[PDB]
Each structure stands twice: as C-alpha cells, then as structure tokens.
Design a protein around this ligand. Structure first.
Ligand SMILES: Nc1nc2c(ncn2[C@@H]2O[C@H](COP(=O)(O)OP(=O)(O)OP(=O)(O)O)[C@@H](O)[C@H]2O)c(=O)[nH]1
Ligand SMILES: Nc1nc2c(ncn2[C@@H]2O[C@H](COP(=O)(O)OP(=O)(O)OP(=O)(O)O)[C@@H](O)[C@H]2O)c(=O)[nH]1
Ligand SMILES: Nc1nc2c(ncn2[C@@H]2O[C@H](COP(=O)(O)OP(=O)(O)OP(=O)(O)O)[C@@H](O)[C@H]2O)c(=O)[nH]1
Ligand SMILES: Nc1nc2c(ncn2[C@@H]2O[C@H](COP(=O)(O)OP(=O)(O)OP(=O)(O)O)[C@@H](O)[C@H]2O)c(=O)[nH]1
Ligand SMILES: [Fe+3]
Ligand SMILES: [Fe+3]
Ligand SMILES: [Fe+3]
Ligand SMILES: [Fe+3]
Lengths: 422, 430, 384, 389
C-alpha cells in the first residue's frame, strides 16, 4: 500500500494494482501536460499538470465509493468494484493532448475537421495500450478482478456507453455517476480540479467534498439509483456551482488566456506538416496524425511547444516566429465577443466568413475562437433514500488601422449571421 | 502598472521597467525549469517553476525596501533604489539550469570538474545578455536609472562583491543583504520559496513575512548598517527556522528525490557528447559546454529531459534507458548515508573520483559479487541575527547502486561501510 | 486602537472615541445582529456594536484612500471624519434583535405608524449629541455642527449638508457599501461561511468617475471578478442564514411573545413617562432602554399578566416550535377565512482610460396546510 | 437522523438524540446568556460568544477523543455507552457558570459570602442534577442503553472530580476517561481545546495548535503506574504549539489591565445591589434565572435603592474606569485585602510520550490624584506584607 503526499488531498494511499498502472510510460506521460494549458501564461501559479490531477480523481473516487459502501452495505459494493471506480477515475484523462483542452476542441477541428475526436475517446484507447504494453491484465486477475468484464466497466465510466452499460448491470447504476457524471454535473473529477485549480490560481474554493461525501447516499429516483445529497446540506452545492462559475468566468474564459491558446494552436498548424512523431512499426506521424496511433500519441506532450521554439530547421520558421511573439508578448489583438442567440467541424470556415462580410483584410490575419461552457436528487431525514457558447474574434495585425477594420467586418459578420450586437 | 495574480502573495504590482525584463526569451525561459527539480517525481504537488518564484522574490524585494524607506527617511531610500532591489530579486535566478540545483550542483562538476561554475555566476551572465539583446539599458535611464552604476549594483546584489562593493557606497550596505544574505540566511529569497514550496508540497508554515517586514528596521551594529528585527517578533523568526528545517529534512533531503536527481544527472552525462545546442555565431554547444555561451544557454531548460526521452537516435541508447527506468520506477537503490564530520569536506572537483574510490574499497570479508565503479552513484548533499527594543531602537554523503539484486546490494553495502571506515567518515546506521 | 478579528486594528481618533463612550452608542452591544438566527446558528452571538465599528472603519478606509489616489477630489478633513461618524452611527436605531423589530413587530402592533430602523438612527443620534455634549467637541476638531451633523444624517437616511460636487461621498455608507462589506464579511466569520470578497482590494482599486454627468464610485474592469464573488456572498448569506426556515419562525415566535407583553411591560423614558413596548420608538429617552433584555424579562417574569407571553418563550426553550405549512397585519384573518411570515429583500473604469466609464405560513397541522392552500389561490398567489 | 449543527470552529457537530434532549431544557439553554470572557467583551468587541456555543464544542470534541481511542484500541473496552457519558460530561461541563463566568465564583462570591466554599464545578453538579430531575431525562437515558444510577455519578465525577481509587463511577482500568474532559495533572483536555480555539477566533489571535492532529495520533498507555493518555514523540512540536496559545490568551486576553478592572467594577455593583444574587447559588431553580441579565437589570433600574449601583454602571458606559495602581492568598481572605478608603485589589490566578498568582490594585477615584496616594499606600503594603517590590 503506497502513499503519496498531496497539497490538496493530504495522504493518498495507492493499492499495488493502481501503482502498477501509475508506473507506466502511458500514465507518467501525464507529467507533461499543463492543466489549464495556455492559462499558465496568464496565471503564473498554474503550472500544474494532469498527472497529479489524475491521482486526485482516483483518490476521490475511492473516497466516494468506499464511503457509500460503509453507509449502505446493502448496495453490495465489493472490494473488486472499488478498484474499478478508482482505476476509472485514475485513467479518465489519459487522452488529453498538449495544453489539455486546447487540443481536442480547438486544434484538431482546425487541423483535421474531418475527424470526430474527443479526449474521452483517447483515454479509452490509451488505457488499452497501457494494459496491453505493460501486461496489466494478469496483475488485475492477481488482485481479484475479472479483466474481460471489468475493463469494459472501466471504459464505460470514462467514455460512456459503448440499460446501456455492459460492465455492470442496472442495480449498480450509481457507480457510473461517480467518476464522470454528465446529467447532474457532480463527479469526483470536478471536485478535484475545482479544488485543485483554486489552490493554484489563488481563489478560495467554497465547496467541501469531505462533507458532501459524509452526507452522500444512494437513493431510488424515478425507478433508478442515483447518488443524492442531504436536504440540510444543499448550501454546500450552491457554492460548488458558484465555484464552478467563478472558475469559468475568471480563469478558463480569460480574455488573454484563450488568446495565447489560439496563438499556440496557430503555430501548431504551421508546424504540422514538418514535425514528425514516431509511432508503431516505425511509422512517422505528423502532429495532427498522431491521435491515430497510441504508441505515437504517448510521445506527444507539452514538449512540442519548446521544440518549435528551440528549432533551427527553416522548415519550422513560420511556426517558430509565432511562438517567439508569445515570449516577447506581442499577442493577437482583441476585436470582440458575441453569442448565438456552432459545431467544431465548422470551425474551419469561420475565418473565411469574416473577411468577406463587407483597408484590406484577408483570412490569414483572422483568428476566431469558440468557447463552450435543480437536477440534483435529495433525501430527507424522515424519509431517506427517496428523491452556453461564446464566440470571440482576434486579429493578427496589431496596428490601429487594420484593427478598426477588423471590428466592423466582425460587426456585420454578426448581423448577417444573426447574433447579438457586440 | 501591471498586476499579476499570484497564489502566495495575492498581488504583485510590476513596475513597467520590470515588465520589460520579464517579456524576454531570457527571463521567460524560467517557465520551463522546475524549482525543486527532481522533487516533482516524489511530490506531485511540487510542479511549480522558477518563473512564478522569481516574481515573488521581486515582489518581496520591493515590499522590504519601501517599508524601510517609509519607516526611516534618514536612510535615503530612493524610488531608484527600490527599482534596483526589485530588479535584483527578480533576476536572482536567471542562471539556473535544467531542474535547478541538479545542474550546477551535481551535473556540471561531473561533466567538467576543472571548471568552476555556479548558478549565481550564471544569473550575472544572463542578466547582461538580457539587456544587450533586448535593449533594456535605454529603458532604464528613461525611468530614472543610471546604467553605469546600477547594473553593477544589481550584479553585486546577485553574485556579490566583484569596502568591496562598487555599485553603491557603504552607507547603504543594508541593501546587499535583502536579496542575498550570506551571514544569517534571512533574505526575501528564503521567504518566497519557503512559502511557495510549502504551498505546493503540503507542509504547514508558521512564518509570516507580512508581520516580519512590519517590525523591520535599519540599525547601527559594529559601526555598520544592518537589518534588524523586533525583540517582540523574535518568536516569529523561530517559526521561519521550524519551516526551514521541515523543508530540508522532508522535501529537499528525500531519499528517493535525490536518487531521481542522480538518475537524471547520469543520463545527461551519457547524452552530453551527443546532444547539440545552437548558440552565438552558429556555434554548436553540448550540454556541459552551454554554460559558456548565453545564447545557447537560453534554450537549455527542463526540455532537454524530454528531448533525450523522446529521442530515436541509437547514439542516445544508453541515455534514453536511464530515463526509462524512472518511468518504470526501476530506480537506483539506496545503499547508505554518512557524514564527513571532523574531516575536511568533499570538494566539487573530486566528485568524479568518488565512485572510483568506493568500488576500490576492500570489503573485509570476501563476497560473491564484485562491483565496479560504474555501479556506484555517490551523491553529495550540502546545506547571526540582531534585535532592537521598543524604548531604545552540514554536508551529507550517500551512496546508491544501479544493480538491484538483494545479493548484489549487500556487496555494495559492505564496500560502502569500508569506504567510510578507511576514509574516516562516520559509520553508517543500519 | 481596537482589536478586531475582521478588521484587525482600528485606529480611533478621539472624536470617534467620545461618540462611542456614550450610553446611547454602547447600547448596541445588546442587540444580536441576526436576532432569532442565534437560535439556529450557535456561532452568531455578535451584536450591532462591533458591526458599527466595522462600518465606520470601512467608511474611513474608503474616503482617505480616494483622497490619496485623487487629491483633486477635494477631500476635506471633515469628509474623513463625517463619513466615519456616519458609518459609525448608521445602525443606532436598530431595536431588540434588529430587523425582526422594524420588519415585523412595529407593523403588527401599530400598523398605522411608519417607523424603520433607519429613521430610528437619526432620532437616537439627535438624542446622543445633544445630551452628551458632542457639539463642542466636533468644532474642536474642525467640524461645523450646522452643516456637518446634517451630512451624517443624510448618509444614514440633492442634499444640503454637502452639495452636488461632493456626491461621491453619499454612495459610501448608504448605496455596494462599506456597510455591506462589514456584515457580509462579519456574518461569514461567525456563521462559518466562505467569504470570497476582499474589500481591502476593492478599496485598493476604487476610483472617482464621471458617468452620466455625475461623480460616482467605480471599480476597475480587471477586478470585476471580485464583484461577482460578493453577490454570491450576498446571495449565499440570504439563502442560508437570513431566509432560514426555522430562523424566521423563531423570530415570529419572539415577535408574538413580545405582543403578549406589549400592553403590560413599561419602560421609563423622558420625564418619568411610562411607555409600552411598541410606544418606545416615539421617545428617544425610553428607546435607549429597549434592548435584548426585554427577551429575558418575559422569561424571568413572575407576573401573571405576562403568563401567556412567558409560556411562549418557555415553549421556545423546550424546543416545541411552530410547524411549517407552506410558502408562496390583515393577513392572518385572511387565511382563517378560506374554508404568516413576510420576507422581503455598476460603474467600471479602465486602465488606459481612467476617470471614464416571499410569504410563508405556519393531525391539526395537516388540516391547516390544506386550509392555507386555498388562500394562495384566493389572493391569486402561487401553488406551494 | 443525527441532528447536525453548524459550528464556526468545528464546522458541523453531530448530536446524538439524548444530547439534544439535554440541550433543549431551561437549565441548559441558560448558557446562551452568559458571556464567555465575561469582562473581556468591553475590551475585545469580537468576544461576543457565550458558554452555550462553547459547551457544544466540548461535547463535540469529547466524543471525538474517546471514539478515536476505542477504534484505535478495541481492547481498551470503550463501549458506545462509555462515549455518551463523556459527551454528556463535556456538554454539561460549564452548567454552573454564573454571570460573566469566572468573575462570579472567583472574584465576587468570596467578597459577598467569604464563609461559603463555592466553585462553578460544584455548581454544575447541582445544575446537572436538577436538569435531569426537572426535565425527566432519566427514562430517556435508560431508553438509549445507559444505567442512570452508575452513570450520573460517572459524569458528576468527570465534571467535579471524586465526590486508593476514589472514583465510584468507573473502575481503575478505565482511568483514561477521567482525563478527557477534566485533566488535573497535565492541563491537556478537550475543554482547553475548545476555548483555546474559540477565544482566539473571536479575539482575533493566531492559533498554532491542531486538535485534529493531536486527537489523531493520541493513545492510551500503561505508564506512571497508571492507564493515562499520551501523544507521539514527533508531535512534540504540535504540543508545544498549544502552549504558545495558552499563554498568549492569558498574557493578552485574560490578564488584561483594563479587562480585570471592568471585572471588579461589575463585581462591586453586584455587591451593591445584593433569593438574592449571592444567595442564589443555593437554590438551582432560582440560579437558573441568574444570567448576564442581572447586569441589565441593575443598569436599567429605576428603584432608588439601586441608584449607586446604577451610577457605577453609568461609570462603565462613559468609560471612567478605576485607575490602575500597581501589580505585585486564600479565598476566605479576599475581603480583608482592601482594608489591609475605597480600594479595590484584585487577585488573578491561572505529560506522556510514545515511540502563578498576581495581585493588582485599582482606585475608585481618579481625580484627587494623588493617585499616588493609592501608589504610596501600596508600596508600603507590599513591603509590609513582604510581597514583591
Ligand atoms: N507581460 C506579462 N504578463 C503576464 C505574465 N504572466 C502573467 N501575465 C498576465 O498577463 C497579462 C498580460 O497580457 P496583456 O494583455 O498585455 O496585459 P494588459 O495589456 O496590461 O491588460 P490588463 O489585463 O488589463 O492589465 C497581464 O495582465 C498579467 O497579469 C508575464 O510573464 N508577462
Ligand atoms: N511509485 C510512484 N511513487 C511516486 C510517484 N510520484 C511520487 N511518488 C512518491 O515518491 C515516493 C517514491 O518512492 P518509491 O521508490 O517509488 O516507493 P518507496 O516505498 O519509497 O520504495 P519502493 O516502493 O520499494 O520502490 C513514494 O513514496 C511516493 O509517495 C510516482 O509517480 N510513482
Ligand atoms: N473607550 C472604549 N474602548 C473600548 C470600547 N469597546 C472596546 N474597547 C477597547 O477597550 C480599550 C479601552 O481602554 P480604556 O481604559 O477605555 O482607555 P485607556 O487609555 O487604555 O485607559 P484609561 O485612560 O485609564 O481609561 C481599547 O483597547 C479598546 O479597544 C468602547 O466601547 N469604548
Ligand atoms: N433543537 C435545537 N436545534 C438547534 C439548536 N441550535 C441550532 N439548531 C438547528 O435548528 C434546527 C431546529 O429545528 P428543528 O425543528 O428541530 O429541525 P428538525 O427537523 O427537527 O431537524 P433537522 O432536519 O436536522 O433540521 C435544527 O435543524 C438544528 O440544525 C438548538 O440549540 N436546539
Ligand atoms: Fe479530469
Ligand atoms: Fe531563489
Ligand atoms: Fe449595518
Ligand atoms: Fe469551560
């Protein structure tokens, strides 16, 4: 039983099987992916990576499952189930690319509009490669799990359905709500990064998971088992959504923060053809091509930022000069924001529309970013166990002649595309 | 006035001059060099880099002088003096290599023993290079500074004396103790990384800089102006040293942490001859040679770790596998610890020869496994306050082994105990 | 200097000290801020006294900071003292258990007369200065009694104390307020609620601004996030503490218990005149005596005229409170005939371009809940 | 179904239904109207807090300490029954406190009735007895698995002490239970932990001590020829940190020049109006009503007999305190001390591992100062009585 020292969670004990998963080139790969991505460049405190977050989600998953189990033994929660929810919360973020969310959502739609790709899909594909290349299946059976059935349970917790779920039957439905919960917006993953980003950004985090877990119970609602909260402890939830909202409004949706994200994205596109990443069978993959092979994708981390920056190859000159501008602080200028009163595939066309909306501006000077941002069941003391899209535009030309021009092309772009007035 | 959101200090206002220095390839380079270096692989919380630390030291530098300036006008503390102290604390750590203290503390001595290199010497070379290549010197005189004298003052605050100090006179001696304090070990640098390492490592910190600065005053001692603290705020000083002790015993001196430090160093030595970094005048530099040229050194960060790890060249075969062992946790094994008490300390030049010495230390009773120098890692770890009144104002030596078998390690342990015995260090504790 | 858990060290200029050391001001030490809320949240013992000290302090913190940042604002030495005294005496008129009194009790006993804690604050302030001789002390430290005393009253209740050019001054105590900042920060401290807002910094980045041809107080655009966390603190504090189901119930029990005692309890005021509980708001000599003592006076009373009043407080201590039916003066008669608590509740500048821009009702309880439900439909309210 | 209370110090306190039954009583609710620091409030505005919210903490902390030993060491034989006695003991620990707490049993009664040997601890037993008797808690006790005859004595012993192995409530193998609420040897108990953490919070003082950690790594041991409670050798730094706070609160808050002046001011006015106030400690039915209310009943009174008491209380509100003369004994004798000429003279009074009395004098008249008259008498009194110079 290994223990790791955490600033947020204190002491995290790791069952030897988890450790076997952690000590792998596929999981250690997460030491090199900044959580907030571009956000480190606006908030100097936020250097932290996905690796230390993963241990957080794994810890919390174990905290929620074990705690529900002792509170409600009739849930028939086995020791085998506990590792499965842990291992799932642990490998949830295996698929994240360079700078986390910048990759799946901003870059790939631009580099390869054709492909439907998410980081959740990557986490599943990576998880298999982790198991296959390190031979974890026998170790799983060594600690009392059944690999054929449990690996399916784990993959479903991460990506979702491949009664929908094949890993566990409907009586243990609540288990799916622990690591990734889409309906409620309550999962041990958020509790980690909600608490974890606040620790680093310098914001007070009001939500207390230790108390929520204290008063959490599995209950019947609409003929389905879901995880529910106490009625007296509803105040703890309201601070979560505000903490959830503060973190979005301030950090994730920061004017400068997502701007640096697009500059980096912009350089990657400029570097995609020329930079090669070695994969399976010695096949060379480009930056956009890497997500196909997990052997190659294992190599793709935040390293890619610095190799362009440090590159001497003239083939990488245009991409490098964009990254140089980040370090000298000569950024893209902000034009305006709007709302759809859009799909990722269609991101491709968005700059082409603004240049031709009617000093001359072309598409090459236009960057357009798309940002994407009760339902809680409750039990009672007397009767327990009873129940946007924001669109911004930036410009590559900084001078005050080209920038005014950019705004009106933008304003008409909004008018004909029937959005709100900027 | 730019404001930066810092988790430790809340708000660091940055004077326009300071900002011009930051937005440079030479300073921004500090974003890709982890503060604790190897410690990240033992503490997941300690991800933080030199950059966010530097800004703190700069901020604290400013907080200290302004407070002395406001409290004691006879001191002649100018707005010019404040900026220079700020610039010093800000650029204090420019010369740090990959993974900080591993580079100039373990690596460079192994790669180039003859060469005398410190990171303090590095920050001075870098600071000059920042200004020349970014034309910051004209920016200074515009905001009321004197390039001739102040650049000397700043460099002296950092490295020290090249009355020894030529940048400023003796009546303002107290300024040299703010960023770099050799006597007691109390400076704005200690305070930042004390607070920041605790924040990330998860250690309880009692020391309050905000209060210590509040009750700080300049005083006459030994016919010399020094920084002093209140007699009432004596307990608070003790809280700093309780923290200072925790950070060392727990974090900086972690058994595995310095092992992973030695492992990285080892891969570097094996990759040194083969890895090329382009510098000034199109001159190609190796990893150990880079410290000479600042143009090349600008590019040298924690990236070099990933460049070796992700490399496909067969020349880097041995170098990549040392890094591979880290990812699999097939680490070097700890043999034992000892101290050179009484006897003269080890010097940096001789670090090279130390594994050769232990391998050739005759273990009393013969054993079935004979070890050569290449299986031995030997690491060397290395580690005055005035008061006023209200009415009247070590060296640690460890050995590790690359071969892990339980029969293979015992031979090593017996070699080590012998090495301490013949060299009169202390007997290792079981 | 005073030691505060929230504001740390509060420097007190002797004029302030003279105002504080009075039977009229030191009186507010006996008025629980949350009132009935103490019986639900055990930490909230705190009173209006230490709150007042907070508001005066914050008030002083705001103007002087504007004065140094913008000397051009024409910040007089009087302005610093007046706003302090204004923020200091802002809550003088509060009755026993604070808002329970002004919000529920006076409206029930004497529905006709409009008396609020704000209106009360001036009458007490008037009784205070005149009866303890503060007027000579004010002019002694550079004040003008005729003009300055009115200015304070104005902040408490364009304006004759100060002209339209010193308009920025009026937005400070009563508006975003130095007042709001105290009880938002103060209540979080005692209740155990996260207070995200930082006033010291709002004060750091606060500025005088011309907008719509008016000098008003503004905030920095980058420090907009600081504003959002406050309204959250503002919203959280209401949802949890101020609008608490049991909390407002216990206030109503006390309100009713005070009524059974209204006719019978007498307090001596000006001229040895006997005033009842509801009548005290009229005479300021008598009002100084009406504090939270009145609660225990019913509890400890041996008098049988107050037997019914006492039996309610007894019912409170044994914890047999009223039962909640549903949510959606004349009102109780209204529900009874169908075949009750009533609760009621920005400029920015830029760095590059500064100086620019509910009704609730309380197995006989099951029947009542059904009786109530018709009343909502009856007056065209919402379905519970 | 365990009712939870929101506490600022401890966060949330779980209450076993019995504890709740004890709390909802005229005798326990009495603690809502007794200021903790007493005189400290007129010197520290933050210190509004009363004995009530303190009692719940001690009750909460008490439960935290015993259970931790039981789960850590099942062979110690801590029953779920044993735990409740300690919770109830910690909960009712402060039942006997009078108006403004320690001012009452240790600065007033010695003056009012020097003859009588009275402590608030002795009072809490009397209050605890009448509470149960007058609220019918005894059947509820048997309802949750307690045995009233043996347990009421055990609790009473936890509070006051023994009423050779003296204690009749529990045997010698369960010695550790007696150190939890009341610790006579060390001064380390859950009582200290609450008001240490609680007073700092209201006073605005920094606290280094962590009870959550001390409770976590604490264990019961066979040393000192006794089963006693201990801490780890490494957690000496944590223990030392409690001691910086204990002295801080004493040096700063409890032993304040002005704070102790206002205590005697209140005390003198109390003597001045004096079942009566001094006699009340005899009857618990009457004592139940005796709270901080008495301060206000003196202050707002119109009766001419209490006029001087009011004029002294008037003196409080206008901030004309006694003038402090100087700093430099048994309870019966506090009375003779000023006589030894309206002089007030106050007397202030204040470990296992595994692998003072100060006297101050004030004067009622500031003017005719000649405060030196008080000072000249004092220097002679100490010299004459061979105290410190
Ligand atoms: N220049 C610079 N800014 C940094 C750095 N790290 C974080 N920042 C933040 O990033 C922002 C810099 O982007 P800019 O758009 O140029 O800042 P600005 O133009 O002054 O605009 P404001 O946000 O209103 O201050 C600043 O607000 C800083 O707080 C850094 O290393 N250099
Ligand atoms: N295994 C592992 N430990 C980590 C990691 N990151 C930080 N740690 C911590 O760093 C320490 C590394 O020591 P290890 O050698 O891996 O574990 P150990 O118990 O000290 O020694 P062994 O388990 O016998 O190898 C552990 O105690 C962990 O708490 C990681 O990624 N993998
Ligand atoms: N004057 C006054 N002080 C208060 C009040 N409430 C709390 N205090 C605190 O009580 C202390 C006042 O001490 P005082 O005795 O009134 O003044 P002093 O100058 O120290 O002593 P004297 O001049 O002898 O009265 C200060 O530390 C205040 O922080 C109050 O309502 N009025
Ligand atoms: N009985 C009681 N409740 C208190 C006390 N102090 C705070 N409280 C809170 O006030 C509420 C009392 O109202 P009740 O009618 O007893 O509420 P309840 O339905 O019985 O219990 P809950 O469901 O936990 O709210 C409790 O929920 C406690 O959280 C106290 O001293 N006695
Ligand atoms: Fe995640
Ligand atoms: Fe440093
Ligand atoms: Fe107010
Ligand atoms: Fe106590």
């Amino acid at each position: 039983m290994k223990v790791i020292n955490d600033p947020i969670h204190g002491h995290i004990e790791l069952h030897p099987l988890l450790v076997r998963i952690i000590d792998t080139p596929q999981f250690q790969r997460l030491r090199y992916i900044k959580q907030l991505g571009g956000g480190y460049y606006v908030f100097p405190g936020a250097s932290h990576n996905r690796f230390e977050h993963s241990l957080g989600v794994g810890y919390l998953a174990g905290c929620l499952v074990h705690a529900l189990g002792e509170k409600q033994p009739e849930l028939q929660i086995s020791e085998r189930d506990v590792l499965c929810v842990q291992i799932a919360g642990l490998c949830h973020d295996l698929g994240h690319g360079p700078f986390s969310h910048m990759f799946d959502g901003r870059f790939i739609p631009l580099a390869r509009p054709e492909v439907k790709w998410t980081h959740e899909q990557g986490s599943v594909m990576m998880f298999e490669h982790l198991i296959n290349s390190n031979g974890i299946k026998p170790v799983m059976e060594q600690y009392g799990l059944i690999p054929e059935e449990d690996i399916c349970f784990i993959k479903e917790q991460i990506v979702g359905p491949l009664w929908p779920y094949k890993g566990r039957p409907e009586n243990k439905s609540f288990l799916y709500e622990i690591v990734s919960n889409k309906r409620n917006g309550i999962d041990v993953d958020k509790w980690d990064y909600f608490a974890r980003d606040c620790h680093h950004l310098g914001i007070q985090n009001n939500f207390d998971y230790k108390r929520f877990i204290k008063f959490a119970r599995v209950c019947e609602v609409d003929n389905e088992l879901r995880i529910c909260a106490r009625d007296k402890e509803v105040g703890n939830l309201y601070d979560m959504f505000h903490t959830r909202n503060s973190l979005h409004r301030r950090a994730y949706q920061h004017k400068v923060g997502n701007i640096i994200d697009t500059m980096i994205t912009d350089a990657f596109l400029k570097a995609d053809d020329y930079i090669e990443i070695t994969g399976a069978g010695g096949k060379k993959y480009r930056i956009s091509t890497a997500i196909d092979d997990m052997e190659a994708y294992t190599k793709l981390t935040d390293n890619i930022f610095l190799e362009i920056l440090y590159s001497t190859d003239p083939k990488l000159k245009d991409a490098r000069e964009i990254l140089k501008q980040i370090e000298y602080r000569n950024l893209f200028k902000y034009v305006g924001e709007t709302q759809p009163t859009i799909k990722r595939e269609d991101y491709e066309s968005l700059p082409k529309e603004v240049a031709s909306a009617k000093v001359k501006l072309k598409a090459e000077d236009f960057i357009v970013d798309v940002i994407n941002m009760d339902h809680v069941s409750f039990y009672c003391k007397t009767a327990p166990n009873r129940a946007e899209q924001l669109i911004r535009v930036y410009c590559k030309k900084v001078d005050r002649k080209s920038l005014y021009a950019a705004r009106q092309y933008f304003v008409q772009w909004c008018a004909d595309r029937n959005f709100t007035k900027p």
